[PDB]
Design a protein. Sequence first.
Length: 23
Amino acid sequence: CAEPMTLPENYFSERPYHPPPPC
């Protein structure tokens, strides 16, 4: 993945994935 910076309660929800899905 590029630019690592994802976390729980702020990266996975039930809405239109805002962040990159491949990461």
